[PDB]
C-alpha cells in the first residue's frame, strides 16, 4: 500500500490536521539527550479512522456544487503522539509563513500569513490546552473533536477555540437535573485523581451548591492505589445510596475491581460518558449485583457512508497504479483488519462536522454567491474568527450552531443497564435537552423491592430539635430530639438542660416546671 503519501493535498486554502496516528511504547517518553523528538512506531487504529473521516469530508466539500464554487480546498495532516513535544513541531509548521520554512517573531501581525487557514485540533484536552494557548495567541481558528473540558470554554484564555462535542458542563447539569428530579438530595461524589476527574468534580460541586443538593465529601480516587480503600470506607460510613463516579476508565476499573473484591454494598452509580461505555468494566462476572448504573450519551446521526468509504479508499491504496501519484512510516504497513476493528466509531461524525463547519464559515466569510465567489484579497484567520462566532451549519441534515461558548448545541439520552446473564445492555429511559423528560416507569432498581432507593436529608426541624449540620459545606440538617423533663435551654443551641427531681416537662422541651 501507499497511504502516507496521501496525507497532504494542495489547495487554494489548506486545513491543518492533527490526529493521534502513533502511540509511544512503555519507555517512549524517553529522557532525550538531545532536542530531536521521538517517533511513535506503534500504529493505532483510531487516528487513521478519524483522518479518513476528515479526508472524506474534504473530498465531499470539493465535490459540492454550491459551497465554495470554483475554490479548491486542501488538507495537511500530522501525527500527535498524545505528547506536547511531538505536537509542537507540526503546530509551529502550521503557523510558519506562507510557502516558507520559518515563523516570525514580530511585534504586530497586521500583515502576517500562516500557511494554513484553520487547524483541526487534537483529540485529548491536554494537547487541546497546550496547543490552544499557542494557536489562540495567533488568533488561529482551532476546531477540536473530543476535547470536553469546560475549562477550555473561557474566552479570556482561548479566544479562537471551538469544538464539536458538548463540554463537560452539559453532562454534569443533566446529571444534576437527574438527581434533582429523582429527589436524591444527599449524595457522594467521586472524581478520578487526574485533571479530568479533578476538574469535573470541581464543576459538579459548584453545581450541587447552586442547586442545594448536598455533597457528603469530595473524594478522589487513584488512577492505575492504596487510598481507594479509605475512600470506599468513607462512602460506606457516610450512609449514601447514590454515588456519582466521574472517572477515567482505568480508575473506574480499579475501583470496581476493589469493590467486588470487597463485596461492597449495592448502590446506585451515576456514570460519566466515558466510563459508561465500559469496554473494560463490563467483563467482571460479579458486576451484575454491584448495584444500579445510570448515565448519559449524546445523540448524533451516524456517518453511514464511512465503512464503504474506507473499503473503497484502501482498495485504491492497494492498487499500485494510483500509488504512482511519508510522515507516517507506520501507516503503509497497516492491513485493513486493524481499521475494520473500529469501523463504527461515533466521533468520526464530530470530525466530519468540524470540517464542514470550517468550510461553511469560509463560504460565509467570502460573502460568496452560490453561482461563484468574488475575486478577493486572500482571506486570513481573524476574518474567519468574527464570522464563526454565531454560525449555523448543516451536517447532512441536523443543522448545528456555534455560540460564544464555543460549543455546538446538543441533546442527551438517559440510559440504564438492564441485566441478562453477565452482560449489561443499554436501554433508553428518558431525554434531556436542557430539562429532563424522565420515563420513570421503565426503571429496574437493584433492591429486591424494585422501588426507588432513598438518599436524602432535611432542611427542616421540629422547633426543639438541636441545630446541627453535616456535609462538605454544611448542606444538610441532622437535628435530633431530647428526652422529656430535660430541656434545651436554647433551641438554637445544643445543650439539653436539667432541673430538680420534683420538676417535669414534655419531650423536646425548652422549659421545666416544678
Amino acid at each position: 500500500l501507499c497511504l502516507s503519501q496521501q496525507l497532504r493535498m494542495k489547495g487554494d486554502y489548506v486545513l491543518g490536521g492533527l490526529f493521534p496516528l502513533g502511540e509511544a511504547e512503555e519507555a517512549g517518553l524517553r529522557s532525550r539527550t538531545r532536542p530531536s523528538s521521538p517517533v511513535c512506531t506503534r500504529f493505532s487504529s483510531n487516528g487513521l479512522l478519524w483522518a479518513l473521516a476528515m479526508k472524506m469530508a474534504v473530498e465531499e466539500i470539493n465535490n459540492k456544487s454550491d459551497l465554495l464554487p470554483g475554490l479548491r480546498l486542501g488538507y495537511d495532516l500530522f501525527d500527535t503522539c498524545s505528547e506536547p513535544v511531538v505536537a509542537m513541531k507540526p503546530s509551529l509548521m502550521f503557523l510558519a509563513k506562507a510557502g516558507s520554512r520559518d515563523i516570525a517573531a514580530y511585534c504586530n501581525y497586521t500583515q502576517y500569513q500562516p500557511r494554513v487557514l484553520a487547524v483541526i485540533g487534537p483529540h485529548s484536552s491536554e494537547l487541546a490546552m497546550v496547543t490552544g494557548k499557542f494557536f489562540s495567541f495567533f488568533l488561529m481558528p482551532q476546531v477540536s473533536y473530543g476535547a470536553s473540558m469546560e475549562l477550555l470554554s473561557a474566552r479570556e484564555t482561548f479566544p479562537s477555540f471551538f469544538r464539536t462535542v458538548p463540554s463537560d458542563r452539559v453532562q454534569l447539569t443533566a446529571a444534576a437535573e437527574l438527581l434533582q428530579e429523582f429527589g436524591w438530595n444527599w449524595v457522594a461524589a467521586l472524581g478520578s485523581d487526574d485533571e479530568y476527574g479533578r476538574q469535573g468534580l470541581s464543576i459538579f460541586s459548584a453545581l450541587a451548591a447552586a442547586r442545594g443538593i448536598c455533597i457528603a465529601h469530595e473524594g478522589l480516587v487513584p488512577l492505575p492505589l492504596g487510598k481507594v480503600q479509605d475512600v470506599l470506607h468513607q462512602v460506606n460510613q457516610s450512609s449514601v445510596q447514590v454515588v456519582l463516579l466521574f472517572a477515567s476508565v482505568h480508575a473506574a476499573h480499579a475501583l470496581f475491581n476493589y469493590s467486588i473484591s470487597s463485596r461492597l454494598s449495592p448502590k446506585v452509580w451515576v456514570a460519566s460518558e466515558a466510563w459508561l461505555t465500559s469496554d473494560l468494566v463490563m467483563g467482571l462476572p460479579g458486576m451484575a449485583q454491584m448495584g444500579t448504573v445510570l448515565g448519559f450519551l449524546q445523540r448524533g446521526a451516524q456517518l453511514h457512508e464511512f465503512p464503504q468509504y474506507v473499503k473503497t479508499h484502501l482498495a485504491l491504496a492497494t492498487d499500485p497504479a494510483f500509488c504512482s501519484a511519508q510522515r507516517c512510516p507506520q501507516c503503509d504497513c497497516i492491513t485493513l483488519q486493524n481499521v475494520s476493528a473500529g469501523l463504527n466509531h461515533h466521533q468520526t461524525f464530530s470530525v466530519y462536522a468540524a470540517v464542514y463547519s470550517v468550510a461553511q464559515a469560509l463560504h460565509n466569510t467570502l460573502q460568496c454567491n452560490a453561482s461563484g465567489c468574488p475575486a478577493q484579497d486572500p482571506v486570513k484567520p481573524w476574518q474567519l474568527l468574527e464570522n464563526m462566532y454565531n454560525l449555523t451549519f448543516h451536517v447532512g441534515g441536523l443543522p448545528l450552531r456555534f455560540d460564544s461558548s464555543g460549543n455546538v448545541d446538543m441533546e442527551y439520552d438517559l440510559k440504564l443497564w438492564v441485566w441478562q446473564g453477565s452482560v449489561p445492555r443499554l436501554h433508553d429511559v428518558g431525554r434531556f435537552n436542557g430539562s429532563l423528560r424522565t420515563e420513570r416507569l421503565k426503571i429496574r432498581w437493584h433492591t429486591s423491592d424494585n422501588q426507588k432507593p432513598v438518599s436524602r436529608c432535611s432542611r427542616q426541624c421540629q422547633e426543639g430539635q438541636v441545630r446541627r449540620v453535616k456535609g462538605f459545606h454544611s448542606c444538610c440538617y441532622d437535628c435530633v430530639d431530647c428526652e422529656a423533663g430535660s430541656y434545651r435551654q436554647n433551641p438554637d443551641d445544643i445543650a439539653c438542660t436539667f432541673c430538680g427531681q420534683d420538676e417535669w416537662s414534655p419531650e423536646r422541651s425548652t422549659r421545666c416546671f416544678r
Partner: protein
C-alpha cells in the same frame, strides 16, 4: 536602556512588572503599563541586574567574557508566548523550523523564567522542544516535579509540599486542631487547597470550613453579588469556633476582603498567610491590621546580599512608573532583608558557574566558543558550590534546598517589619528553633482552637461523626470502667465479681 546589555552570551529574563488579573488587540502585541505595577517584581528584576553586573565585575571566574542580559515582562498569564519566540529566534528575528535543533544556536543561552506557575508551564512547553535551560524563582507549584514532562526546568525555591508541611508542623506545635481554609478562584487556590486537605487528613488536623473567595479587581467598584458574597464569607467565619485561618490567595484579591472584615469588626483571629502574600508590603502598609489580630506567614530565608540596596539606588521593554513606585517603599525594603532576592541572585550565579565549568575555564584564561543550550542544561545540573554561605545544588527533582522562615508581622517600623519566629530545614523536613511570639491574648497565652474540650477522668469518647477531631464524652456506667490504656472509646465491663464507681478507671468488690 536599563533592560538590555550586550555581551558574548545573553540571559533571557522574564519578570511580572504589571500584573492585573483582568491576546493580541487589533493584531498588535499587548503592553502592560495600563495595569498596576508590582513592587516586588521590579525589585527582583533589579536583583537579577545586580547579579549579572557583579558577575561581569568579578574577575575570579570568567576570562573577560561579557555576560549580557535581556529582560521582557511576563505580565502574569498575558503577554506570554511572544517573549519565548523572541528569545528563540535568530539574529534576524525569524525562526526556521528543523527536524533536529541540536545544530542551532538561540539568541539567548538560558532563561531566568517566569514566576507565575501558569506562565512557567506555558514557557516550558515551548522550551522543552529545544532543551533550553529554564530556571524559575519562587514558582512553588509541585506540578513542576513531573520531570519527564518538564525536562529543562530547574528551581531555586523549595516546592509547595514543604510549605504545607511547615504550616502543619506549626499548627501541631501549638495544638491548633481546628482550622479554616480560604482559597482564590484559580489553580493557585485549588491545588494548594487539595494538597492541604491531603496533608491535614494524615496528621490529626481537621478543616472546620473551606470556601472560595471572589476574585475582585483591586480597584473594583463592588457588584451587589460580590458585596453579599464577602459579607457571607465573614458571617461563616464568625459562626465557626476556629480563629485559625489559612488563606491561599493572590495579594491583589485580598485587599478588599480585609477592607470588608475591617467593617465587620471580627477581630482576634490568627491569620496564616501563604507565601503569595506573606511578605507583601502593600497589604502590610494597612495600619488597621494591627487591630485585626495576629499575622503569620511562611517565606524563604532572609540572606543579606552585600551592596544590593546601594545598587538599587522587541515589544514592551520599558517601564516608567516603576521608579516612582520604588522611591517610597524603599523605606520598607531597606529594613526588610533580601528574601526572594536571594532566589534570583542564586539563579544568576548558578548559570554563571555552569557556563564557567562548561568552558572548562582556568582562572580568567580560556577560549570563547559557541554553546548549544542543551550542553549548558546538561552542565547546570552538576554545579555544587557556596554562594553566600549557603551551598546551592539541585535535587534530582531540580529543586534547591533553601531554608524557609515563618515571619510574624510587626508595626514598630524602627525594627524589621517582618520578624522571624521559626526556621524550617527541608532536608530534615522539620520545623525548628521557634522564638518568642507576641499574641493578641491578654497574658500572651497561646491562642486556642479545638473542636471539643478533652474528656474528664472516667469518660469514654463520643464522636459526633462529621470529623474525627470532634467528640463528646460519656461517663462510665456502674459495672464498667475506662481502660484508656488499651481502648478509649468504650468503658470495659468489670469482672463479674466486681463493680465500678461510675466515672472511674477501675473496679471494686461489692455485695
Amino acid at each position: 536602556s536599563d533592560f538590555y546589555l550586550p555581551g558574548d552570551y545573553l540571559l533571557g529574563g522574564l519578570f511580572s512588572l504589571h500584573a492585573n488579573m483582568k491576546h493580541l488587540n487589533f493584531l498588535q502585541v499587548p503592553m502592560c503599563k495600563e495595569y498596576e505595577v508590582k513592587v516586588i517584581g521590579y525589585n527582583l528584576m533589579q536583583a537579577m541586574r545586580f547579579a549579572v553586573e557583579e558577575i561581569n565585575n568579578d574577575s575570579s571566574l570568567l576570562p573577560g567574557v561579557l555576560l549580557g542580559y535581556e529582560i521582557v515582562d511576563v505580565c502574569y498569564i498575558s503577554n506570554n508566548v511572544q517573549p519565548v519566540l523572541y528569545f528563540l529566534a535568530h539574529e534576524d528575528n525569524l525562526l526556521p523550523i528543523q527536524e533536529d535543533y541540536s545544530n542551532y544556536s538561540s539568541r539567548v543561552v538560558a532563561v531566568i523564567g517566569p514566576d507565575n506557575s501558569e506562565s512557567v508551564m506555558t514557557v516550558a512547553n515551548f522550551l522543552s522542544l529545544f532543551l533550553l535551560p529554564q530556571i524559575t524563582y519562587s514558582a512553588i507549584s509541585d506540578e513542576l516535579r513531573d520531570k519527564v514532562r518538564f525536562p529543562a526546568l530547574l528551581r531555586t525555591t523549595p516546592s509547595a509540599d514543604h510549605h504545607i508541611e511547615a504550616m502543619v508542623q506549626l499548627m501541631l506545635h501549638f495544638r491548633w486542631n481546628w482550622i479554616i481554609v480560604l482559597v482564590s478562584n484559580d489553580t493557585y487556590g485549588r491545588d494548594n487547597g487539595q494538597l492541604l486537605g491531603e496533608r491535614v487528613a494524615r496528621r490529626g488536623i481537621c478543616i472546620a470550613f473551606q470556601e472560595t473567595l471572589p476574585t475582585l479587581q483591586p480597584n473594583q467598584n463592588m457588584t451587589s453579588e460580590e458585596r453579599q458574597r464577602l459579607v457571607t464569607i465573614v458571617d461563616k467565619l464568625q459562626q465557626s469556633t476556629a480563629r485559625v485561618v489559612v488563606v491561599f490567595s493572590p495579594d491583589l484579591t485580598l485587599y478588599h476582603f480585609f477592607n470588608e472584615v475591617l467593617r465587620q469588626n471580627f477581630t482576634g483571629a490568627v491569620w496564616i498567610a501563604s507565601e503569595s502574600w506573606a511578605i507583601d508590603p502593600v497589604l502590610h502598609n494597612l495600619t488597621e491590621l494591627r487591630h485585626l489580630g495576629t499575622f503569620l506567614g511562611i517565606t524563604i530565608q532572609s540572606v543579606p546580599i552585600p551592596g544590593f540596596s546601594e545598587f538599587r539606588e522587541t515589544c514592551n521593554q520599558e517601564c516608567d512608573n516603576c521608579l516612582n513606585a520604588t522611591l517610597s517603599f524603599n523605606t520598607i525594603l531597606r529594613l526588610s532583608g533580601e528574601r526572594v532576592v536571594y532566589s534570583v541572585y542564586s539563579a544568576v550565579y548558578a548559570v554563571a558557574h555552569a557556563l564557567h565549568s562548561l568552558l572548562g575555564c582556568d582562572k580568567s584564561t580560556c577560549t570563547k566558543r559557541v554553546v548549544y543550550p542543551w550542553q549548558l542544561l546538561e552542565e547546570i545540573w552538576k554545579v555544587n558550590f557556596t554562594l553566600l554561605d549557603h551551598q546551592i545544588f539541585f535535587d534530582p527533582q531540580g529543586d534547591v534546598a533553601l531554608h524557609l522562615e515563618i515571619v510574624q508581622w510587626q508595626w514598630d517600623r524602627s525594627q524589621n517589619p517582618f520578624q522571624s519566629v521559626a526556621s524550617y530545614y527541608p532536608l530534615q523536613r522539620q520545623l525548628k528553633n521557634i522564638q518568642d511570639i507576641s499574641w493578641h491574648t491578654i497574658n500572651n497565652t497561646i491562642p486556642m482552637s479545638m473542636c471539643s474540650k478533652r474528656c474528664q477522668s472516667g469518660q469514654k469518647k463520643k464522636p459526633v461523626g462529621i470529623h474525627v477531631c470532634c467528640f463528646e464524652c460519656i461517663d462510665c456506667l456502674p459495672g464498667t470502667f475506662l481502660n484508656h490504656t488499651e481502648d478509649e472509646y468504650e468503658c470495659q465491663a468489670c469482672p463479674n465479681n466486681e463493680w465500678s464507681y461510675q466515672s472511674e478507671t477501675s473496679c471494686f468488690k461489692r455485695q
